[PDB]
Design a protein around this ligand. Structure first.
Ligand SMILES: N[C@@H](CCC(=O)N[C@@H](CSO)C(=O)NCC(=O)O)C(=O)O
Ligand SMILES: N[C@@H](CCC(=O)N[C@@H](CSO)C(=O)NCC(=O)O)C(=O)O
Ligand SMILES: [K+]
Lengths: 183, 183
C-alpha cells in the first residue's frame, strides 16, 4: 500500500482525504517537524527540500501535494486518458497550489486577489455542485481543501459567497473528509 | 495553431521559451491588463480567473503556466508514457510554481526558505547538468525561469551556490532563452 509521509496540520491530510475518497489503504508515517526529522538524511532522501507530504508507492517516491493528487487520480483511472483531459485537472491542481493559495493567504495581495478569486469560484459553484460538474473529483480535494482552511486560519467566512459557503460546508461533512482533515 | 495569451512581463515568456525549445509555431495574443481587458467577458471565457498566460488549441482552452508547460511537453512526446514518469515532471512543475517561487519571492519567508532551497538545488545541480539528469527538459524551463528571475527582480545573485549559478548562466545563454525571456 501507499506510504504517506505527513505531520500534524500538514497537507498530508489532503492526500489522506483523497485516499479515503478512493477507498485506498495507506500506511501513514509521521515526520516530527518540531524535532527537525524532515531535515535529516532519511527524509531528505525522499524529498530533498525537506517538506511534507511525500508518498512511496513501492520503490517510487513522489513529493508536492499537487503532483501526488494527480498521480493518485491517474492511478485510480478517474481521468479520461488524453493529454487534454489530464491538462484540465493539472490546471486546477496548479491553481489550488499557486494562484488560489497565494491570493487568499498572502496578506499583501489578499485585499485585491481574494474577492476576485471568490467571485469567479462563486459563479462556477452556483452552476454546478462540484468544480468539474456534477461529479466530485480530485479537483474538489485540491481547491476545496484551500477554501475549507479560510475560516480556520484567516477567521473569515463565505457569507457574501453563498455557493462557496454551501460547497465548503458539503465538503467538510463528507465521511472521507471527517476521517482525515476533520479528525 | 496554438494561440498564447500573454501581456508584458507575464509568465507567457516562460511558455514562449518552451515553444522556442520545441520549434513550434504559435500566435501571440496580447491581453491589455492596464486597460482591464483580462476582466471582461471575452477573456474570462478563456480563463475565468482573468489571468495570463492561457492557451487556445482549437476549441481547447488551458490556463496556469505550469499546466501549459506540461500540456506542451506531453503533446511533443518529450515525456515517457507512464503515470510515474509524468508524476516526476509534475512534481518539479508544482515545485517551481509553489515551494520554489514562494520561498524566493515572498518577503516574509525569503530569509529562511531561500538559502535552504538553493542549498538543496546546489547538491542536485552539482551531480548533473540539468534537474532530471543529462538531458534538458520542460523541468529546466519551469525551475530555471524562477531562478533566472532572482537577479532580475531581487537584485540578488547565486555567488554562494556555484553549481546553481552555472546552471542559470547556461540556461540564459541558450538561443531559445535569448529569443524569449532574454528579449
Ligand atoms: N507546495 C508544497 C508545500 C509543502 C509544505 O510547505 N509543507 C510544510 C508543512 S508544515 O506542517 C513543511 O513540510 N514544512 C517544513 C519546512 O518548511 O521546513 C506541497 O503542497 O506539498
Ligand atoms: N499561477 C499562475 C499565475 C498567473 C498570474 O498571476 N498572472 C498575472 C500576470 S500579470 O503580468 C495576471 O494575469 N494578473 C492579472 C490580474 O491578476 O489582474 C501561472 O503560473 O499562470
Ligand atoms: K514501515
Amino acid at each position: 500500500m501507499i506510504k504517506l509521509y505527513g505531520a500534524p496540520q500538514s497537507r498530508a491530510s489532503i492526500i489522506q482525504w483523497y485516499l479515503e475518497e478512493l477507498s485506498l489503504p495507506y500506511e501513514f508515517v509521521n515526520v516530527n517537524l518540531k524535532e527537525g526529522e524532515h531535515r535529516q538524511a532519511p527524509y531528505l532522501a525522499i524529498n530533498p527540500f525537506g517538506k511534507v507530504p511525500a508518498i512511496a508507492d513501492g520503490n517510487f517516491h513522489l513529493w508536492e501535494s499537487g503532483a501526488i493528487l494527480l498521480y493518485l487520480a491517474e492511478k485510480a483511472s478517474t481521468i479520461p486518458a488524453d493529454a487534454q483531459a489530464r491538462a484540465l485537472v493539472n490546471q486546477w491542481i496548479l491553481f489550488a497550489n499557486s494562484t488560489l493559495a497565494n491570493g487568499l493567504f498572502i496578506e499583501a495581495v489578499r485585499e485585491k486577489e481574494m474577492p476576485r478569486l471568490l467571485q469567479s469560484l462563486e459563479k462556477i459553484l452556483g452552476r454546478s455542485p462540484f468544480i468539474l460538474g456534477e461529479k466530485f473529483s480530485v479537483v474538489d480535494v485540491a481547491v476545496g481543501s484551500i477554501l475549507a482552511y479560510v475560516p480556520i486560519m484567516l477567521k473569515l467566512n463565505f457569507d457574501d459567497y453563498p455557493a462557496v459557503a454551501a460547497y465548503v460546508q458539503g465538503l467538510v461533512q463528507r465521511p472521507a473528509f471527517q476521517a482525515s482533515i476533520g479528525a
